[PDB]
Design a protein around this ligand. Structure first.
Ligand SMILES: Cc1cc2nc3c(=O)[nH]c(=O)nc-3n(C[C@H](O)[C@H](O)[C@H](O)COP(=O)(O)O)c2cc1C
Ligand SMILES: Cc1cc2nc3c(=O)[nH]c(=O)nc-3n(C[C@H](O)[C@H](O)[C@H](O)COP(=O)(O)O)c2cc1C
Lengths: 457, 465
């Protein structure tokens, strides 16, 4: 009914003696002794030349009408699972990217109604194809003919109200497209949620493109090839090393504030004592929150991770990709500047001294925290992306941000148990930070911030 | 270079013309010219129109104010290029618009024509206002596509193999589309100068990034106060979903303040536990757990917020802007005094509310959690965390969703530590299908959606000595 059907590229088709197996990651379909007409039709689906009506004829022609009716019936189950692509050749191919899949071809009325390309639709290069995608679609459209890119260019260039009945004459003149191809193309674009039929929205207005795209893509064995580039702790930045104090955790296991007290007492504190936080306090704080407790090689892993660490917080895949850079404006036995915390040696390493660039990071934290007392220490959290990205496809960055939160709450509770003044910070300029430190922004970048000062009695 | 392209003022720039002064104005910078001479004024007007070259603009100034004034004009104009005030165009094809200060366009060496190149994987086309725009998180420019023939060129570039060499492949582009070789060379020079092309066709530590991750990172890691206009639509707690309400137990927190596990013990003992006891977690345990982690402790109106937030709550975890946009849906496969199904936790009344009973759809959410935690024991309870986006999006521009995800983490660690103090079996779950969940519950995915998951069962006691 209107499109050429074909199998998803994600689908694999193991053909053998006696059996035919159709296979995705999720689902498996075995056909034992499939009849010639059905086999012929399954081959033409792999080619992609044909309509449902034509595929049904192939089955019936050899296996009879009941077999063909069964085939069409059972084939729409596979459409639901996202196994069937719909194409308008030679222009475009819709590929499902989700289960529970459906294409409602719209009413003829669309031709006289004002429409527009969705503000969430975008074109980009996927592998060796141009693809049209949207966080609002269950499909990605592979652009086969460059003349489709010309059509989208004109749609985006049009005014708010593009009406196909009055504006299609331009598209058909300059580009050598027939009216029936162009009508089928628009029907697919509407069916795959790339078009707006109401130019107005209601609770979709509130979303920004980059947020909805990220949410969509993250809410659906690999080898650690670059293990030597992204080791379990970062290679030392500076030859200067300031050793930090180590508290007696066995003593604290019985002496420390209770978990219930820590949770119920926890506040964000932005006003500080005149006496800055001490180096001894910073040292105890970091040991309790972020140290390397052990180093182990997992004896089995086929992913070839090599060495990994255990730390005082949980972390997706283990791996522990975050680093901590204490930016010191005021501290006990510490000159002002940017440091890097080294969690295995339990040491600080100077990264940069107090310049105008480093001061503006402290100003941003101060401004972000309501201008309610000059920061003493700001902990800038960074992520070494290569430590995690190899393992996680689309969810790596969403894991990282949940790790920042995991760390924030750990900082909050330990700070509360030490009578320090904690506050998370929502924003920060990563390009400014990457420039101050030595960092390639693609390799490592700030993803979180946390202010820490001495609290008043 | 300013000679290879035609010049215009950024659309973000505004030009207040008055009897004796001329003011050029962005959000950041302000330039006042007192008694500017006719030739300079004429040239500044044509920059606002666009479509003239540096050479032509210099002629306009010189024609009326003399050659020295024109030389001065061209010299001083490259200061404005640095501030992001000047667009560079290859008419009638494309116009590069700066989106950042400290702006520079290094037109590449002729060598690019014989070198293998490719469109950046981070370059993307989308509809901005009434134009098609090419953008990248790796660029300081956005290119407005003026001619559809540029979209055809990009379509072919993306369709090409790893190694597209202009010297050997440009013949196709020039044949089918009516473009001249000099237009096409200028276009490619601009695309290279604005970071839309790769000259090392292989990358190094940029390969590892997926488009949606790099875009989100760049936009979230970069004025009058906003108003909470839809406060009534997004109140401090969600309106009750079901009439059935199962009340939950409330522990003595004053007693726990002294009797509970220490914070150090909780942190040092915390483990992810995926294997469970035969006895499922009880309703009394679930109730104590949620009270300690996620209840509304107080309701207050802030007496002088100008943002008109109205009522807000305090809870056992911190939250960006306060506001507390998250909800918790306990999905119960096995529990003490609770039939299997999906519930919603109500943090002010401290009650559970049935959302959906045990269907094949609800079972597949439990299967996904089981599969995600290694298939190491059937889940007992899975806590699905959701976000009511309108509670937060009004206040935060580009960072709202990154705050939400940090809140999920904040909650995960709170769940982990309390579970550890209660001797329960906790584990965070990295992924989950929001569409499937939104369908099972009653939810519009644009209004509210799952953003986190956490499994919780009864732990074994067990030994090792
Ligand atoms: C954000 C986040 C997501 C996680 N996702 C999963 C998951 O999908 N599956 C799983 O088995 N464990 C998950 N975990 C638990 C980690 O795998 C665990 O912290 C680590 O592998 C081992 O540390 P632990 O045993 O000290 O918790 C997650 C943890 C965090 C912080
Ligand atoms: C992810 C996150 C980001 C935050 N960002 C900021 C911030 O930018 N500025 C600020 O003053 N407080 C920030 N906070 C602290 C909250 O404002 C605070 O938790 C809440 O306003 C008051 O609750 P509390 O005093 O119990 O923490 C943040 C908290 C979290 C969890």
């Amino acid at each position: 009914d209107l499109f050429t059907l074909s199998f998803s590229p994600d689908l694999s088709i193991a053909s053998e003696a006696e059996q035919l197996t159709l296979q995705s990651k999720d689902d498996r379909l075995i056909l034992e002794h499939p009849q010639p007409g059905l086999r012929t039709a399954l081959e033409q689906l792999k080619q992609g030349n044909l309509t449902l009506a034509q595929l049904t004829e192939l089955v019936s022609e050899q296996d009879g009408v009941e077999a063909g009716i069964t085939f069409a019936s059972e084939l729409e189950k596979l459409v639901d699972l996202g196994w069937i692509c719909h194409s308008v050749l030679p222009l475009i191919t819709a590929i499902p990217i989700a289960k529970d899949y459906e294409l409602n071809v719209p009413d003829s009325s669309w031709q006289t109604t004002a429409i527009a390309l969705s503000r969430f639709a975008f074109l980009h290069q996927d592998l060796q194809q141009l693809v049209l995608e949207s966080p609002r679609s269950k499909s990605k459209l592979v652009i086969l003919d460059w003349r489709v890119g010309a059509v989208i260019a004109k749609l985006a260039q049009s005014d708010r109200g593009f009406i196909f009945a009055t504006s299609a004459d331009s598209l058909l003149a300059d580009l050598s497209l027939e009216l029936e191809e162009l009508k089928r193309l628009f029907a697919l674009l509407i069916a795959t949620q790339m078009m707006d039929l109401e130019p107005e929205d209601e609770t979709i207005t509130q979303w920004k493109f980059h947020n909805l795209l990220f949410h969509h893509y993250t809410r659906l064995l690999p080898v650690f090839e670059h293990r030597d580039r992204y080791p379990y702790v970062k290679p030392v930045i500076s030859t200067q090393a300031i050793p930090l104090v180590k508290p007696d955790l066995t003593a604290l296991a019985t002496t420390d504030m209770t978990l219930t007290e820590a949770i119920e007492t926890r506040r964000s504190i932005r006003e500080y004592s005149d006496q800055p936080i001490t180096l001894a306090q910073l040292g105890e704080f970091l040991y309790r929150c972020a140290r390397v407790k052990a180093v182990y090689t997992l004896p089995e892993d086929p992913m070839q991770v090599g060495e990994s660490t255990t730390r005082p917080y949980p972390s997706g895949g283990a791996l522990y990709e975050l680093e901590i850079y204490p930016l010191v404006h005021q501290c006990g036995d510490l000159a002002a500047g940017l440091y890097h915390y080294q969690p295995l040696s339990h040491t600080l390493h100077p990264v940069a001294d107090w310049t105008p660039e480093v001061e503006s990071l402290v100003y941003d934290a101060w401004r972000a925290t309501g201008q309610q007392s000059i920061p003493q220490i700001v902990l800038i959290i960074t992520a070494r992306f290569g430590r995690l990205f190899w393992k996680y496809h689309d969810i790596a960055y969403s894991l990282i941000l949940k790790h920042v939160g995991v760390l924030y709450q750990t900082f909050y509770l330990v700070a509360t148990a030490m009578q320090l003044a904690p506050s998370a910070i929502g924003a920060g300029n990563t390009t400014k930070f990457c420039q101050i430190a030595g960092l390639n922004p693609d390799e490592e970048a700030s993803v979180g911030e946390f202010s820490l000062g001495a609290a008043k009695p």
